[PDB]
Amino acid sequence: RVGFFQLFRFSSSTDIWLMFVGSLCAFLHGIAQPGVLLIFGTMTDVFIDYDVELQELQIPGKACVNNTIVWTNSSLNQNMTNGTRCGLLNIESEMIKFASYYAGIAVAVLITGYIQICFWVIAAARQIQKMRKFYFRRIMRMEIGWFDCNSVGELNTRFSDDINKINDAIADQMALFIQRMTSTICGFLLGFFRGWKLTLVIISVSPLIGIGAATIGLSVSKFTDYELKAYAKAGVVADEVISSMRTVAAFGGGKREVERYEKNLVFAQRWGIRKGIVMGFFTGFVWCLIFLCYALAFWYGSTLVLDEGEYTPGTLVQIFLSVIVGALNLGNASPCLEAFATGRAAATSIFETIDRKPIIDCMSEDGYKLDRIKGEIEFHNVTFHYPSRPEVKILNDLNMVIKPGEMTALVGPSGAGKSTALQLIQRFYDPCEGMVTVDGHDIRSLNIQWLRDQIGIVEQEPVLFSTTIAENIRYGREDATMEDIVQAAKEANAYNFIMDLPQQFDTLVGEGGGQMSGGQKQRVAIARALIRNPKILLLDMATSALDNESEAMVQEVLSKIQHGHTIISVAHRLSTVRAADTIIGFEHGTAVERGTHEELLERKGVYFTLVTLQSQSYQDSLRASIRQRSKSQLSYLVHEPPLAVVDHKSVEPAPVRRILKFSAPEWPYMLVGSVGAAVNGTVTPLYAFLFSQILGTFSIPDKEEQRSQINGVCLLFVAMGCVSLFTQFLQGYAFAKSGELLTKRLRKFGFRAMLGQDIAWFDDLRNSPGALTTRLATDASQVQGAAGSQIGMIVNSFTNVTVAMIIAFSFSWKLSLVILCFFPFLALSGATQTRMLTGFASRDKQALEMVGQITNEALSNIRTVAGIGKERRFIEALETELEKPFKTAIQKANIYGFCFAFAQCIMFIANSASYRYGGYLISNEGLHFSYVFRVISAVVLSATALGRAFSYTPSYAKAKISAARFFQLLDRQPPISVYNTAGEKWDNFQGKIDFVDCKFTYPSRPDSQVLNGLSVSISPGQTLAFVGSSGCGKSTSIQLLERFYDPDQGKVMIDGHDSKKVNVQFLRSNIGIVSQEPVLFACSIMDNIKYGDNTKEIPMERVIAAAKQAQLHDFVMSLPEKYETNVGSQGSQLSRGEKQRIAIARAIVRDPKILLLDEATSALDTESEKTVQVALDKAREGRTCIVIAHRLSTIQNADIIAVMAQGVVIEKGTHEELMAQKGAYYKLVT
């Protein structure tokens, strides 16, 4: 949507110069990497020429008998027919020259790379600082309707993240893109313009590699969606069971659910296997294509192109490496394009909200300004509806006037637009129709900044800012003096309270500061209103948010010193309007009454008389994890060139011992994958060795032998390609299978154990059903990243390194030690880069936290800022705060630039030193020149591989964290284990109950809501009813009788057996519960009814009897499919009045000895209550029932009752004798 170059719209001249210089330096640096190969070609040509000369000089004196052609004295004044063929080439001098060239290139790369990053990062930081301050300046000027439409929760995200995305888009990423694009262009150009036949030939094979890479890329996304579609077949079961855990526990259906989940994990396992197969196969295919391209390139570059005489070996090597480098760095530019797209997309909202012109805003050009106003204000035909929902009219032809120097009160229903009238007179909105005037002038065309200065409002709910009390009061008026603040506090009745504080007026009083009671906050808000001595005072239900004592105290401050200046007040309670000079009533958004107390007492005064009479979900996480893991595995496609230059850049955690011990059962797959990875690691140094071998053959004098050896090496390349294909595919498949098996096992055990935890474990907010589902789906999958792939990567890197070191030390140990000095730096470059980057990002976010704090404080209560406070102060405060992120950004620029430039330049220094020493070795010791290339390339490639090994940072730690989260679960021993052993069982269950003064407080809930002193007993067959308060007892007795919780103190006696001694499952097998909400399962009606005794089979006749007893048999028979009809989410919606009867049948079918009717008959209508009450009453025949009902005594008049509201029971007996003793039961008939 937004043009990419629009992102730089805030660039200044200094920024333009910085970006231009950075781009120039990036261009020069990018040229360096493919440009160095030109020197390498001539270096290898010199090596080969010297080797040919040296091999010739070993022949035994050809010219010592005859003149012949090319002997030693050809360098001297002798008649050798072919001319100079010796002496003139001093190898050491040439190598000195080339090492000097490499050192110079290294210095240039260092300087240019540093400047590039430094300048680009600095320019981006400056531009985004300016952008953020401008964006905030624009928000604060939006009309409040714009804030009604837009949520603060997303404005904060726009301010924090979206601008960070733009930063990433115009930050160093642009410089890296420029460098890599110029590098690849030069890499291809220096091939084409040195040899075009070979360059064209090796390019012509590129399309197949492109197809392979594109196939892998498409596969990532395709199989992400396929996996998500696959696992949901079990995700639905998991979510269903966990979201309704209490019913499953009550009916003991855990085993069936576990089996159902196990039966469904297979689809996800299968799709994981297939994704692994595909990805491994295509990676192997790409590797095979790479090696076949190598073989073709070398065979063709030899035949008819080098042995025929067109090229020199140096040109061949240079062309090949230049094309490889170009292809590699074209690939590395892809992340920059993704970053550019993300930035271009994210900038749409920011720029549109920056360019938006506000309807009404703080300004001085809005027009007229009055002086010496009477304060008189009036309305005319005002009709208005909130722009967030224009469907509903709030005001309708409002025509009312407030006289000056007096008070006016507003009364009426809350929905009569009572308060909205206030927001219009401080001009939060303009009326849709009509006009509002003050002192004879329309509010529009009157300078808003001046207008809101005359008005002073008392907020409906007090709001204070994170500063001192003195400043919070001074916000009302800037030039207010300290004694003025003291006077305002005294008038507001806050002075005495404030002076009692530990630090008095200077105490911080924000939400982050010392907390205060609501009354004191309202008092200080009133002081803030008063300090500006407003001409018009608005009281928008000040006391509505306070308790009775604070209500009275604040009302005492109000209506006491309020005279001279007009007051417009909305009454929280009607009694307070008695002193108003006038009273205006609001109904259907129009003024009606218009008469003072005596005049509105002309008739009933419905409101006043009435008040006096009455009062006197996992999908996001799973998708992200799947995509991130797929991308992580994609790193193995990396392939550098030999020689040349490297590819610069492509709750506590559990011990790995536990993870591997848990993953033991699938060892053979891991072993096979390890073998595959070992061979794959061996591959790289072997191809470096083959390259060095190729270079050597060009010094062979016998042309036919040279041809034979080159053909042999090409065949070895082909064989290595095939081996790499097969081994890569095998590794991928084996490790994918290991990971999937581990994930399935872990999910099975995790879900199986999750059903064994005590109910209280589910109540914890840390164990929300959404959180549990996310843990089961995502975390169970991430654990494989620490067992399967990690072992393979470790083995791969280890084998690579060991083979490379073996080759290097076998062929030359003196040169290896020289090149080995740079090995640590090459290995640690990438790891240090990544970890420094993430640390800097974390520090930058920590710095942004303060801007987040200030901006959230400003926006969360924009109404207070705009109406009474000052808008400009917050803009300037945020501008001042924005310095810290810029300060951190500058040092990030410096440090990151240095660390990047040094990492780039280290390789060139290594080449310089290594070849400088190799020259000496060739000159003196007599190494074959091929060994120098062999050693250097092998060591460098092993160093790069080892460095890439340490890049496991993003995934390994979180995999261990997930493993720890699962392990803490698996070994947990809940206080009440459904899987516990047998205990205190008996066959003769009688259903006798007895509560012994139980004490209970909920965990994860506040220690209030307590059950205290409950002591009641029920004989078999008698029904007990609980009624009274809506808390502090009643319901919790249901959950204690069932083993959901155990009493904190006291005991519950079931048939004379202590509850804590009875086996949980055996006890729960005899109880039947009904809940106010009849939760059901998506199976058929018959399945739900059969759910009652899932542990055993039952005939259909029992279901018929249960449905008949539940007033359901006839109803279900009327459904299209009868008993087999599907239920719940199937779409066959059934009203609660029917699902309740289904639940009643489910409870009855098991023939429980005890019934728990937890507030049934709470349906939506009286008809449902009538339908279900008969079924409930029939259910209790000959059973011990603990019935709880919200309805009056009509329900519970059947049997004994308890009525208390404090847990303990004092009043107990039949309703008739409860009536006789004049108990609290009378309230049920009063």
DSSP string, 992-1060: -EEEEEEEE--SSS-S-S-EEEE--EE-TT-EEEE-S-SSSSTTHHHHHHTTTS--SEEEEEETTEEGG
If residue 1074 lies in a helix (H) or strand (E), which one and from where to where?
A: strand 1071-1074
Instruction: Give the residue from 25, 247, 225 showing the smallest Cα distance to 117.
Output: 25
Fold (CATH) for 367-446+581-614: Rossmann fold (3.40.50)
Determine if residue 699 is labeled as part of a ligand binding site. Answer: no
User: What are 912's two structure tokens?
Assistant: 């310089």
Q: In what order do the strands lie in the sheet with 582-587?
A: 455-458, 536-540, 566-570, 407-411, 582-587, 590-591
Instruction: Give the residue from 686, 787, 669, 677 showing the smallest Cα distance to 737.
Output: 669
* CA-only gyration radius of the chain, Å: 42
User: What are 765's two structure tokens?
Assistant: 């907010």
CA distance 807 to 934: 8
CB atoms < 10 A from the CB of 67, how many? 10
Determine if residue 186 is labeled as part of a ligand binding site. Answer: no
CA distance 1172 to 1178: 10
CA distance 180 to 27: 9
Question: At what angle are helices 703-754 and 788-811 packed, to 10 degrees?
Answer: 150
CB atoms < 10 A from the CB of 806, how many? 12
Determine if residue 1034 is labeled as part of a ligand binding site. Answer: yes
Angle at 1039 between CA 1035 and CA 1041, to 5 degrees: 110
Determine if residue 923 is labeled as part of a ligand binding site. Answer: no
CB 86 within 8 A of CB 94: no
Query: Which distant-in-sequence residues (6+ apart) come within 8 Å of 598 by Cβ?
Result: none
User: What are 942's two structure tokens?
Assistant: 């092993």
Secondary structure class of 1112 (helix, strand, coil): coil
Secondary structure class of 634 (helix, strand, coil): helix
φ/ψ of residue 903, rounded to 5: -60, -40
Sign for the pseudo-dihedral over CA of 183, 186, 187, 188: positive
CA distance 1119 to 166: 59
CB atoms < 10 A from the CB of 1132, how many? 14
CA distance 147 to 161: 20
CB atoms < 10 A from the CB of 331, how many? 16
List the chain domain ranges.
367-446+581-614, 459-574, 1077-1151
| Neighbour-count burial of 58, counting CB atoms closer than 10 A to its CB (0-12 exposed, 13-18 middle, 19+ buried) | exposed
Instruction: Give the residue from 660, 698, 680 showing the smallest Cα distance to 49.
Output: 698
Question: At what angle are helices 813-820 and 883-924 packed, to 10 degrees?
Answer: 170
DSSP category for residue 546: S
If residue 1156 lies in a helix (H) or strand (E), which one and from where to where?
A: strand 1154-1158
The strand pairing partners of 402, in sequence order, are 377
How far CA 591 is from CA of 269, 441, 598, 1107, in Å, comes to 70, 21, 17, 59
User: What are 424's two structure tokens?
Assistant: 């219009």
Instruction: Give the residue from 42, 290, 315, 329 showing the smallest Cα distance to 192.
Output: 315
CB atoms < 10 A from the CB of 604, how many? 10
Instruction: Give the residue from 846, 824, 843, 826 showing the smallest Cα distance to 835.
Output: 843
CB 901 within 8 A of CB 782: no
Query: Which distant-in-sequence residues (6+ apart) come within 8 Å of 1217 by Cβ?
Result: none
CATH class of the domain comprising 1077-1151: alpha beta
User: What are the DSSP calls for 377-440, one per residue?
Assistant: EEEEEEEE--TT-TTS--EEEE--EE-TTSEEEEES-TTSSTTHHHHHHTTSS--SEEEEEETT
Task: Name residue 11's amino acid.
Answer: S
CA distance 1105 to 365: 83
Dihedral angle, C-alpha 927, 933, 936, 939, nearest 10 °: -110
Query: Which distant-in-sequence residues (6+ apart) come within 8 Å of 931 by Cβ?
Result: 692, 811, 812, 815
Determine if residue 415 is labeled as part of a ligand binding site. Answer: yes
Task: Name residue 138's amino acid.
Answer: R
Determine if residue 331 is labeled as part of a ligand binding site. Answer: no
For β-strands 1049-1054 and 993-1000, DSSP reports them as antiparallel
Question: At what angle are helices 172-192 and 196-204 packed, to 10 degrees?
Answer: 120
- First-to-last C-alpha distance (Å) of the chain: 68
CB 690 within 8 A of CB 717: yes
DSSP category for residue 160: I
- Give the total residue count for the chain: 1230
φ/ψ of residue 517, rounded to 5: -70, 155
User: What are 889's two structure tokens?
Assistant: 């950004």
Q: In what order do the strands lie in the sheet with 1212-1213?
A: 1071-1074, 1154-1158, 1184-1188, 1023-1026, 1201-1202, 1212-1213
DSSP category for residue 510: S
CA distance 644 to 190: 14
For β-strands 441-442 and 433-438, DSSP reports them as antiparallel
CB 977 within 8 A of CB 1003: no
Determine if residue 414 is labeled as part of a ligand binding site. Answer: yes
If residue 270 lies in a helix (H) or strand (E), which one and from where to where?
A: helix 254-302
Determine if residue 510 is labeled as part of a ligand binding site. Answer: no
CA distance 875 to 879: 6
CB 535 within 8 A of CB 438: no
CB atoms < 10 A from the CB of 119, how many? 25
CB 105 within 8 A of CB 908: yes
CB 533 within 8 A of CB 455: no
Determine if residue 1030 is labeled as part of a ligand binding site. Answer: yes
CB 1081 within 8 A of CB 1128: yes
Determine if residue 212 is labeled as part of a ligand binding site. Answer: no
Task: Name residue 184's amino acid.
Answer: T
Let me know if the fold of 367-446+581-614 is the same as that of 459-574: yes
Secondary structure class of 445 (helix, strand, coil): coil
User: What are 328's two structure tokens?
Assistant: 């590699």
Angle at 598 between CA 594 and CA 602, to 5 degrees: 75
3-state secondary structure 1167-1198: HHHHHHHHHHHHHCCCCEEEEECCCCHHHHCC
CB 137 within 8 A of CB 47: no
Instruction: Give the residue from 1196, 1229, 885, 847 showing the smallest Cα distance to 1025.
Output: 1196
Put residue 588 in one of left, alpha, beta given phi > 0 → left and psi -120 to 50 → alpha. Answer: left
φ/ψ of residue 455, rounded to 5: -85, 145
CA distance 564 to 164: 53
If residue 570 lies in a helix (H) or strand (E), which one and from where to where?
A: strand 566-570
Sign for the pseudo-dihedral over CA of 145, 151, 154, 160: positive
Task: Name residue 1228's amino acid.
Answer: L
CB atoms < 10 A from the CB of 310, how many? 14
φ/ψ of residue 458, rounded to 5: -105, 115
Instruction: Give the residue from 317, 319, 87 showing the smallest Cα distance to 193.
Output: 319
User: What are 414's two structure tokens?
Assistant: 């809350």
CB 267 within 8 A of CB 230: yes
The strand pairing partners of 1025, in sequence order, are 1187, 1201
Determine if residue 413 is labeled as part of a ligand binding site. Answer: yes
How far CA 1157 is from CA of 247, 539, 620, in Å, comes to 13, 49, 39
CA distance 633 to 628: 9
Determine if residue 830 is labeled as part of a ligand binding site. Answer: no
CB 659 within 8 A of CB 787: yes
CA distance 1146 to 905: 76
CA distance 421 to 581: 19
CATH class of the domain comprising 459-574: alpha beta
CB 777 within 8 A of CB 231: yes
CA distance 857 to 109: 47
The strand pairing partners of 591, in sequence order, are 586
Query: Which distant-in-sequence residues (6+ apart) come within 8 Å of 620 by Cβ?
Result: none
Q: How was this structure determined?
A: cryo-EM
Resolution in A: 3.2
CB 182 within 8 A of CB 326: no
Dihedral angle, C-alpha 1212, 1213, 1219, 1220, nearest 10 °: -110
Instruction: Give the residue from 960, 678, 957 showing the smallest Cα distance to 791.
Output: 678
Determine if residue 86 is labeled as part of a ligand binding site. Answer: no
Query: Which distant-in-sequence residues (6+ apart) come within 8 Å of 516 by Cβ?
Result: 509
CA distance 817 to 822: 9
Cα 704 to chain centroid distance, Å, stands at: 65
User: What are 785's two structure tokens?
Assistant: 């990243």
Determine if residue 621 is labeled as part of a ligand binding site. Answer: no
User: What are 182's two structure tokens?
Assistant: 């110029």
Angle at 683 between CA 679 and CA 689, to 5 degrees: 140
The strand pairing partners of 1012, in sequence order, are 999
φ/ψ of residue 925, rounded to 5: -70, -35
The strand pairing partners of 508, in sequence order, are 468
| Neighbour-count burial of 1012, counting CB atoms closer than 10 A to its CB (0-12 exposed, 13-18 middle, 19+ buried) | middle
Instruction: Give the residue from 1167, 1168, 1171, 1147 showing the smallest Cα distance to 1158.
Output: 1147
Query: Which distant-in-sequence residues (6+ apart) come within 8 Å of 1193 by Cβ?
Result: 1027, 1215, 1225, 1228, 1229
Instruction: Give the residue from 539, 612, 583 showing the smallest Cα distance to 410.
Output: 583
